[PDB]
Amino acid sequence: RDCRVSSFRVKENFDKARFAGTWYAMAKKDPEGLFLQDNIVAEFSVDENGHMSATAKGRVRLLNNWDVCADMVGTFTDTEDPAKFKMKYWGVASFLQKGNDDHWIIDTDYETFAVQYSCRLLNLDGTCADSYSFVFARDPSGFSPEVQKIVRQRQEELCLARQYRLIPHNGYC
Numbered sequence: 001r002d003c004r005v006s007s008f009r010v011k012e013n014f015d016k017a018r019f020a021g022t023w024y025a026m027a028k029k030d031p032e033g034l035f036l037q038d039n040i041v042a043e044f045s046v047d048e049n050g051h052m053s054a055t056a057k058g059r060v061r062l063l064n065n066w067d068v069c070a071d072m073v074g075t076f077t078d079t080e081d082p083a084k085f086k087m088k089y090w091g092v093a094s095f096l097q098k099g100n101d102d103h104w105i106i107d108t109d110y111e112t113f114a115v116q117y118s119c120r121l122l123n124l125d126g127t128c129a130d131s132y133s134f135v136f137a138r139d140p141s142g143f144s145p146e147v148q149k150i151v152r153q154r155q156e157e158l159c160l161a162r163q164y165r166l167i168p169h170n171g172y173c
């Protein structure tokens with residue numbers, strides 16, 4: 001299999017606090033329009049109250065050919081599903097995109113990898129018309145082959161197999 005968003009599995013008993021820290025974007029499936037290009041690094045935090053938030057850094061290619069290092073902020077609201085959040089985001093720079101997107105943690109082991117996903121528009125059939133997904137790593141060097149195998153499985157389960165591209169890290173930001 002099913003490609004309906006509602007049938008997708010998410011991370012069981014997702015732990016916000018164990019998820020905190022630095023996450024390096026290894027690969028990504030882009031959505032329609034503008035997006036972060038490369039050199040993406042995210043820092044997740046959780047306050048005493050259990051409110052998760054994050055800050056992201058990354059290179060954005062302005063429609064005008066400007067390359068900017070974007071500094072982004074996102075706040076997450078919890079839902080009835082511990083692994084599915086509503087994320088409000090904005091940039092430090094007023095010209096960076098602002099919005100609200102679903103943010104689901106598909107899978108993670110907290111120590112090595114993470115698979116994230118967001119459907120910004122649903123088709124009439126329940127499938128996703130415009131999505132994005134990131135594969136994160138704790139270590140910028142990546143994962144082992146064993147983890148690589150888990151990640152591929154998750155990508156397939158999301159109906160996004162073969163749609164990701166490797167993201168370069170050259171500390172542009």
Ligand SMILES: CCNC(=O)/C=C(C)/C=C/C=C(C)/C=C/C1=C(C)CCCC1(C)C
Nearest residue numbers: 034035036054056060072073074089096097
């Ligand atoms: C031209 C304006 N520049 C842009 O077009 C800038 C854009 C899109 C930035 C989009 C940024 C987005 C969605 C960031 C989403 C996410 C975060 C906030 C931080 C947590 C994880 C993230 C999932 C990595």
